[PDB]
């Protein structure tokens, strides 16, 4: 139903130019979709940036601009600033309804790259008494704030029972997140090696634990 797609994530540095886009599955985005752009910052902060394709609301910095680029609407931040790091939602009008896109998480480099600090916790003896076993892989102090988490059990990757949280900004604007591997108590007895692999900026950090000790 008139699906609207946006780059899920993009990264720029202060002073550079970045361009988010907005594609309509019905066909080419046109001025008649009256494309809008809404900036969302933490704490459900909301600001209307662009309306009617390229109408900049008052108070919005001049470095923002809306336009069409072929079959898409496009928000263009010219000479970005650290305070531009946010989620940017595109909304197209479809005659009788509006549709928001998935959004695009824009990162504006505000500090140097920090690798994640990983720590793996085994199930508590208390919890196993409920016949449930939960391994907890904590992740903190990584920047930019995107990580991938893969679990291995006895050297075999795990497909099911894993759940990872969306990162969260720390006071230092580095990021933290936690992954969980949920097992049955039995399944925890039936295996001996457990690994949590956190990949960040193409570099992987691993923390494992063996019950053979």
């Amino acid at each position: 139903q008139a699906v609207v797609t946006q780059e899920s994530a993009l990264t720029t540095s202060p002073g550079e130019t970045v361009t988010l886009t907005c594609r309509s599955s019905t066909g080419a985005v046109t001025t008649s979709n009256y494309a809008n752009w809404v900036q969302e910052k933490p704490d459900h902060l909301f600001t209307g940036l662009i309306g009617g394709t390229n109408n900049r609301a008052p108070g919005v910095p001049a470095r923002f601009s809306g336009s069409l680029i072929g079959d898409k609407a496009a928000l263009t931040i010219t000479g970005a600033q650290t305070d531009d790091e946010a989620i940017y939602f595109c909304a197209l009008w479809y005659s009788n309804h509006l549709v928001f896109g998935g959004g695009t998480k824009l990162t504006v480099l505000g500090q140097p790259k920090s690798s994640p600090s990983v720590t793996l916790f085994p199930p508590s003896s208390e919890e196993l008494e409920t016949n449930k076993a939960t391994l907890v892989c904590t992740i903190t102090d990584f920047y930019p704030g995107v990580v991938t988490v893969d679990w291995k059990v006895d050297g075999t990757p795990v497909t099911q029972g894993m759940e990872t949280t969306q990162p969260s900004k720390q006071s230092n604007n580095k990021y933290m997140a936690s992954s969980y591997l949920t097992l049955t108590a039995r399944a925890w007895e039936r295996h001996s090696s457990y690994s949590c692999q956190v990949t960040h900026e193409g570099h992987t950090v691993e923390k494992s634990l063996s019950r053979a000790d």
Binding site: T140, E163, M176, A177
Partner: protein
């Protein structure tokens, strides 16, 4: 200045109903369309419905997913717009916002939370997280505290009753089977633990429950 104030959100069983109210105060908004947009962790923003605030001309648009279920309405004498929700489902949970729109979304409300869930008020099961022997050699030791199976949000975690404030990391709650679960860790010098005790104090005001859990070596 303009100010939108939202109200009427809470917890409701699936199939139930709720009616929200967005009270607008400022200059004459005859030229604005009042929108309802909801935000969930799973669908980001999602446009719900909209109404034209012309006293002369009333027009309403609805999203395909709420047609036949939701109805938007306004009462000038009260300077208010309302969203009536019926036959609520789990997919309707989220922070509902109202926004004044004229060309662009010019003003927003603070949002009110609408939660569609059948679960009952459930207190957390606090389990301790302590390192394995592979992690007893580092100069700093990261202790933890798992808070499992609680409802609704929030819980508040403090370590040693607040006296341990630096190095704490409380992570976002995950949801599974109508029940929440988050974790909190604290990293302290290996010379302080286990010599000195370290305890997570979890509080769940919904169930008036507080649990202290001392982390002892495994």
């Amino acid at each position: 200045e303009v100010k939108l104030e939202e109200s009427g959100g809470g917890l409701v069983q699936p199939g139930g109903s709720m009616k929200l109210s967005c009270v607008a105060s400022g200059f004459s908004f005859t030229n604005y369309w009042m929108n309802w947009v909801r935000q969930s962790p799973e669908k980001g923003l999602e446009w719900v419905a909209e109404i034209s605030l012309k006293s002369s001309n009333y027009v309403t648009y609805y999203a395909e997913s709420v047609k036949g279920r939701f109805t938007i309405s306004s009462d000038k004498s009260k300077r208010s717009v309302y969203l009536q929700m019926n036959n609520l489902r789990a997919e309707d949970t989220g922070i509902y916002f109202c926004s004044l729109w004229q060309t662009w979304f010019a003003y927003w409300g603070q949002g009110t939370l609408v939660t569609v869930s059948s679960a009952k008020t459930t207190p957390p099961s606090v389990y301790p997280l302590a390192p394995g022997s592979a992690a007893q050699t580092n100069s700093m030791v990261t202790l933890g505290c798992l808070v499992k199976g609680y409802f609704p949000e929030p819980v508040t975690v403090t370590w040693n009753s607040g006296s341990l404030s630096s190095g704490v990391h409380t992570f976002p709650a995950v949801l599974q089977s109508d029940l929440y679960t988050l974790s909190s860790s604290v990293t302290v010098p290996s010379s302080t633990w286990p010599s000195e005790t370290v305890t997570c104090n979890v509080a769940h005001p919904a169930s008036s429950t507080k649990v202290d859990k001392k982390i002892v070596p495994r």
